[model samples]
Target: TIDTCSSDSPLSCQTDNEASCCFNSPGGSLLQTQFWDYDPSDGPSDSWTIHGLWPDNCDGTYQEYCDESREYSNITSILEAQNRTELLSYMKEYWPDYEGADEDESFWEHEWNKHGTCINTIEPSCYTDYYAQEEVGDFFQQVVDLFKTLDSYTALSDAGITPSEDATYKLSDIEDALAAIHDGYPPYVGCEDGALSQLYYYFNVKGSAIGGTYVASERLEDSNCKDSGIKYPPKYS
Candidate 1:
């Protein structure tokens, strides 16, 4: 069932853009999986697959795994392409923390990277920024707020605490919140903008709260949910 999901590509070699993609759920017991198909050059500059899963029953600590193939590439795309409802079911089934506006694409990616990739490879002790304006700082603050929401939810779930329905939770709702956050700022706030000079500046406003680092680009296209149209387990089921 998870062999047909498809998500939009992270790097748009065609338009130099990225996309935000995810599944939503309505509170049911099911298994959700977020897999991927990555070219070595396309992601992390390595030919390895990375993925995030809920109910990560392996070590009982919301453990994430990575490898050359299988779970990340073909698995995720197939589940995404199969059915939105099915995908949401899987997410909630395993990772119920992924609910609300706080669960933005950036947060998702951060978790995927932290749990799936070698995030420790980066250690920016200190950095400089040109934009220190109050308005820009405030805007970034909002993003931080959004990211916390996702983090809190995920943390609770990882602790094995299932949220109750009518608890004002839903991945779709979070997406809407993230959309609002995106719309709150400029389409492009660059280094010359003074207060919001860095791409990291904007993402930090929202990215850090969810344990995400700055994305290199100013804009992104929701690429998490595309249809890859590939087969899996060529020799097995």
Candidate 2:
């Protein structure tokens, strides 16, 4: 199935298709991932890392397992063969999988197959100078680049929000802090077991993933945290 389409092939555009290529509007996208502090044992525990950049429908629902034709069992090997040492090195620092054993490899593979395949604009066919598994590299690279801009840790700190056992922040304080840096757009904060855990900053892309501008907007989903105090836990060493 990997050979079904050549690198230079144009993404198929079907009038009746709901594929991203056929979408009429700026497509739905998210800079999504879990925070290292949320589950540090499995991650770097020092900096924010990638989960994946997802392209959902404008309505918030999404297509998944989109193209099995491009599925692979290992992404690191794919990048290794392509001499993507630099990218891989960066991933080790930022996109680490906390799951022990071969879990990290599995995580990367899962992200590529599930979300990366669905992004029509970054398809191998869309590239003018394509190499084997180049789309995979582009997927991770773009996510990393975007994550650099929406640093939740720094945004919160700049707004005088920091984790403490005795401190609890109002929901609006977190929203205002993120909005202050994220172009007035607040992220959707999520809680787990009664603590702040994740941030979903919504965006709509103007064009292709490589060159498009991501415009921050109101979250597509509601915040799970209540109006009052929300716990922001500190990272465990």
Candidate 3:
């Protein structure tokens, strides 16, 4: 069943998890992911795969790896135990680890143990018919759902911005174009060496992640890109 606990009813679900608590529930959220089109890796190259769904204090400070007791060394094992083979398949496509360190399992484990566990909003207790590790499934699905809505490739391409080695774009133009379709809050563009590679869309959720919407919010960090003449490079593979 769908989890009904929301920010409006904080007491509906109380948690003793050290990484998560009813008292310190998130006041804002950020949907962050990285595009690996320029990387020479065997990961998803056609689209921006999920990096993580982060919950931050209203002022932007966040807690990482909030609970140690709930930590799992292997995300695949956890999903398999819960019979989330479908989720495992979806994640393999969209939430792959590019670094290839520890066969990508470490990255998934880190994202869950660090960021996913910290989100009290999706805690198992919040669901009407909770199951063991169902929160993990919910968290992964929600992240993928949010990533789908913010298609950076389409957003930039629609604005006449494509990955070209010969073209340089104004940061404001790319920001303007993305903000035009994604809630008016500009994305935080990050560059590596001289190529555009990362996009972070800041948001504030009014209620639960399952039942609520994420509205645009001003970013707390500065872009690692120049105001003018940012490069959008294409994949070499």
Candidate 4:
């Protein structure tokens, strides 16, 4: 029904239906971000972990706590209430907070509050026949699904860019490796102490964040790594 929806102006929505079928505008830039934790390792040692999806403004800036009413805690329990056991299982494996188990749920809560809430396209009003917390379930589902598509670890490894202690890689090579997999659009890579730490795959989403059509777009921002001596460290204790 939302075939006319687009990330650009008005989402091509009928003027009368604007209030109901809202489309993302300023926060059109959706990022399916991933983390590669080395210290206090989390998730699979061979793969990157979830860093949550983000809805940044087109210019890369963002607004958080957009809808405090939706600022929820007990996110894990909420998912459980909805019988999202399979989603819960996948999240437990791929999405980690790096904090102790008891405190990890807080991270999930923060992600939904700070970023997910800002995605107006997924707000309750945007969907028809919406159920309670349906947007929440849809938000996490979208993230995991998108993260699965952009296999950063495999992209780097298949290109001989495996994690190392002292081996430094060229910045261009690292960028190219990932770009090769993502329609030749390079993602923004993040590093800590010169070691690879995070990646942000950019997309302009159309219609509801619940089931939007994601179109890959090159990152509006750049990486902080130096051109040479870029490290890709393995997970450490």
Candidate 5:
């Protein structure tokens, strides 16, 4: 609907060659990541919760806390203030803190301040109605939106991989299951001490992070999981 540049437009994206709404660089390629929390037992046992929507320099370097002025402290009230209660509710369910319930607010704030602020394309300067931090709502909204499309749990389950008390899997089995669903692109299958804990799906966007063409790209780096004996543990009580 609108004319915007792609973070995947090729090359090093050497300069600020386009509008703030049209370009996203130094943090261009986006990664909508998820957490498979099993230790503290977060979120739903059937799903992976939100980690963050991060922008990376296509080369792997990235930025954070890009604008402290835009750093939102009371994300909950802000969402409620702006009539985003439903969005907030969805987040409460799928974006719980990895540490525990009490730390959820800090987790959301840190993610917004650290990664959300760096999204140049959705910066307030490039808006229509231009409500303060409406971009914030959009950022949170889209992370959830994109995440809903990439279900690592179901993808793996359909491929015969499920959370286990005593089973281990080949890394390729996990990777191949996700790749088959994510436009056939392999996701970053992160592990913590041989246990599957995180998965990241790479994206290259051509428009605003809120409403854009989020094209799937191959993960920039291989995961830390070993070739075999990767554990997929259930959320323990």
Candidate 6:
């Protein structure tokens, strides 16, 4: 049986004959509860960081994992505070195909799209003419590109690229795209002036924050899920 003990005590776990069961620090419990900002600007174009995503079941499939919560902090939990190790372990457990490399992004990229399966950017008239006509397609194409990039990077990063360097490249590409979207839109551009203005009122209020999180639709709140599939939701945290 998996012995239950305070997460601080290494004695709680069993390991291999060579002794590699738990990390030396015993901070796994707390790590599982919280998440830090994952700014693409913070890392290299080839890099990726796995933030803690909690309060979700470990079903061993991307579709199953999509039904989890989106907004919460590293210490957002009333219980363990973060689920990093648990989340990671779940990844390895469900997808034994994982080998602890940077390509882990590929695994998540699909899940990210799954999270955005229901977002309706066209409706509520929030997306501008440019967004609906041009940027949206660009955004989806970028999603496909990003998944491939992250997948390739995840597989090769550890051997060829250091985490710090890889992170920079990954973040730069994403941040640049985000800027493009912001610039392409209007102060308000959907309907009559007052209607258009109200449509985007929240844009100025929470746009930056929203762009930050960039969660998939499956992770969004029940009311906020959009109709557009395969797009990640902005952090808006």
- Local distance difference test, each candidate: 0.25, 0.68, 0.69, 0.80, 0.83, 0.24
lDDT string, candidate 6, 127-217, tens digits: 3342212322222232333232233233323333233311322323322232233342211111221110011111111011112122221
lDDT of 3: 0.69
Model 4 alpha-carbon miss at residue 72, Å: 0.3
**10 residues in a row with least lDDT, candidate 2:** 1-10
Clashes of 5: 0
Model 4, poorest ten-residue lDDT window? 11-20
- Angstrom error of the Cα, residue 61, model 1: value is 29
Residue range 45-141, candidate 5, lDDT tens digits = 8898999999887787788899989997788878888898888989888999877667878889999999999887878777766877788888888
| Segments in model 6 whose C-alpha atoms lie over 4 Å from true places | 1-117, 120-124, 130-136, 153-237
Candidate 6 lDDT (Cα, 0 to 1): 0.24
TM-score per candidate, in order?
Answer: 0.19, 0.83, 0.84, 0.90, 0.92, 0.19
Query: Per-residue alpha-carbon lDDT of model 4 for 1-237, expressed as tens digits?
Result: 112355453431221233334467567778889898888788887899888888887777888889989889888988998788999888888898887566678989999999999887777766567778878887888889898898888998999999887789988998999998788889998888988888898887556666667777878787988998988877863
Q: Rank the candidates by TM-score, best first.
A: 5, 4, 3, 2, 6, 1
For candidate 4, what's the RMSD? 3.5
TM-score of predicted structure 2? 0.83
Which candidate has the top score in TM-score? 5
Error of 5 at 31 (Å): 0.3
Question: Clashes in candidate 3: how many?
Answer: 1
Candidate closer to the true structure by TM-score (higher is better), 2 or 6: 2
lDDT of 3 by residue, 68-151 (tens): 877778678777887778878877777766665445688888788988777766666677777767777677777877887888
Tell me the tens digit of each residue's lDDT in model 2 across 1-237: 011222332222212324343231323554455454455443443455566777666667777777898999978888888777888887776676766545678888888898787777777766666777888877777787788888777788888988767789888888899888679878777777667777777776544655465667667776888876788766662
Q: What is the lDDT for 217 in model 1?
A: 22
| Residue 120 displacement (Å), model 1 | 4.5
lDDT score of residue 47 within candidate 3: 64
In model 1, the Cα lDDT at residue 57 comes to 19
